[PDB]
Structures are given as structure tokens and as C-alpha cells.
Swiss-Prot record:
Subunit structure: Heterotetramer, composed of two GyrA and two GyrB chains. In the heterotetramer, GyrA contains the active site tyrosine that forms a transient covalent intermediate with DNA, while GyrB binds cofactors and catalyzes ATP hydrolysis.
Gene Ontology annotations of biological process type: DNA topological change; DNA-templated DNA replication; response to antibiotic
Extra remark beyond the main annotation: Few gyrases are as efficient as E.coli at forming negative supercoils. Not all organisms have 2 type II topoisomerases; in organisms with a single type II topoisomerase this enzyme also has to decatenate newly replicated chromosomes.
Gene Ontology cellular component terms for the protein in this record: chromosome; cytoplasm
Cell compartment(s), UniProt: Cytoplasm
Name of the molecule in the record: DNA gyrase subunit B
Task performed by this protein: A type II topoisomerase that negatively supercoils closed circular double-stranded (ds) DNA in an ATP-dependent manner to modulate DNA topology and maintain chromosomes in an underwound state. Negative supercoiling favors strand separation, and DNA replication, transcription, recombination and repair, all of which involve strand separation. Also able to catalyze the interconversion of other topological isomers of dsDNA rings, including catenanes and knotted rings. Type II topoisomerases break and join 2 DNA strands simultaneously in an ATP-dependent manner.
Top-level taxon in the UniProt lineage: Bacteria
Shown segment, full-protein numbering: 10 to 219 of 804
Gene name of the record: gyrB
Family designation: Belongs to the type II topoisomerase GyrB family.
Length: 191
């Protein structure tokens, strides 16, 4: 009840939270917000590589090789830690609220865990979708076409420019950018 309140307020006044929704600046801020959390995981010393991928279906994904977002459940509440992070209130919860769809995949403790959201509403509980020995977090989102106008597609240059800065403002962090639309790719890292 409290969560759906905060996500409505973001949806109601998105410019407040993400930046201008009509000129691409807010659209691309969506990506940097997701990346910021992967950066924090790298600064804690747990993540060595961040990969940002522009797909051909109007989505972007951000992957890291960190510890993975926690997957534990509150016994008496049911609601998973991952869900709380994605829904509670700039932070990913804002990206989630302004995403037509968002997919979270976590590799942690020998399992792959997945949860889907639509406009920030979880479609089902976090669930096991496989096994792995890798660890890390993958967030993929499709921006709301009710929120964003004029520039609704991700632009490589805007991403490349800010990902490069992010790598030199937190040096030792490797950030790769891949565009599946045309095969363009970059690796940003500084010593
Ligand atoms: C591709 C995006 N990557 C990412 O969010 N990495 C990440 C985030 C963690 C967070 C977090 C996420 C979003 N907003 C705020 C915080 C919290 C905790 C993590 N892991 C963790 C921390 C402490 C103990 N156990 C797991 C995260 C790991 N990777």
C-alpha cells in the first residue's frame, strides 16, 4: 500500500525524479541510475566489471559480476529483499516505476533468480530459473512510452560519453558498452 503510493508519485511527476522526459536526458539518466548501483558494488571491492548493452528491442541491460542483490525472504512477510530494493523509494525503484517492463536476474549462492516488473509492479515472486557458479546482478528495462517522448530510443554516444567519465571517476572499474543494433562496442577502464 505504501509502495504503490511512492511509485504513483514518481509516475505522476517523472521530471522531478529522472529529469526531462521529452528530450532524451531523463531517458538516458535511467541507464546511469542502474549503473550507479553497480559502481557502488565495485567500490565495495566486490565487482570488477560492468557491461551495458543496448538491445534491438528498445531495452538496455546493465550487468555486473558483484555479489548479487540479496534474495532472502522475510519469513512472516514473504516479500524478498530484492523486491524491497526494486520497489521502495534517486535509485532503481525510480527506474522501475518508469519502466514499461523491468527484468532483474541475480546469480547468487549457486542459483539464478528472476523477477519481472511492469511499471514497478512485481508480476510474480522472485523465483529460481537455473543454477550457476557465477555471481552478479543483471537489470534490463524497457522505458515507459507513456513517460518518455521524442527521444524514446537509447543513443550510443550519450551512453559512451558518461560511461567513460564514470570509469575515470571510479578508477580501477572496467565498463563495457555493447550495441547489439549495429555491433558497436567500447571498453572503458583507467589506471
Ligand atoms: C546491474 C545493476 N547492479 C547492481 O545493482 N548491483 C548490485 C546492487 C546491490 C545493492 C543495491 C541495488 C540497488 N540499489 C541499492 C543497492 C544492494 C546489495 C547488493 N549486494 C549485497 C550487499 C551486501 C550483502 N550481500 C549482497 C548489491 C549487489 N549488486
Amino acid at each position: 500500500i505504501k509502495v504503490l503510493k511512492g511509485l504513483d508519485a514518481v509516475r505522476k511527476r517523472p521530471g522531478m525524479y529522472i529529469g526531462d522526459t521529452d528530450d532524451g536526458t531523463g531517458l538516458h539518466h535511467m541507464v546511469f541510475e542502474v549503473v550507479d548501483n553497480a559502481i557502488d558494488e565495485a567500490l565495495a571491492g566486490h565487482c570488477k566489471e560492468i557491461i551495458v548493452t543496448i538491445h534491438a528491442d528498445n531495452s538496455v541491460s546493465v550487468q555486473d559480476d558483484g555479489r548479487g542483490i540479496p534474495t532472502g525472504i522475510h519469513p512472516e512477510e514473504g516479500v524478498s529483499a530484492a523486491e524491497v530494493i526494486m520497489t521502495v523509494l534517486v535509485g532503481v525503484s525510480v527506474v522501475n516505476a518508469l519502466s514499461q517492463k523491468l527484468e532483474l536476474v541475480i546469480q547468487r549462492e549457486g542459483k539464478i533468480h528472476r523477477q519481472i516488473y511492469e511499471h514497478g509492479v512485481p508480476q510474480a515472486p522472485l523465483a529460481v530459473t537455473g543454477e550457476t557458479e557465477k555471481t552478479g546482478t543483471m537489470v534490463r528495462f524497457w522505458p515507459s512510452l507513456e513517460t518518455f517522448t521524442n527521444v524514446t530510443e537509447f543513443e550510443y554516444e550519450i551512453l559512451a560519453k558518461r560511461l567513460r567519465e564514470l570509469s575515470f571517476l571510479n578508477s580501477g572499474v572496467s565498463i563495457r558498452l555493447r550495441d547489439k543494433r549495429d555491433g558497436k562496442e567500447d571498453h572503458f577502464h583507467y589506471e
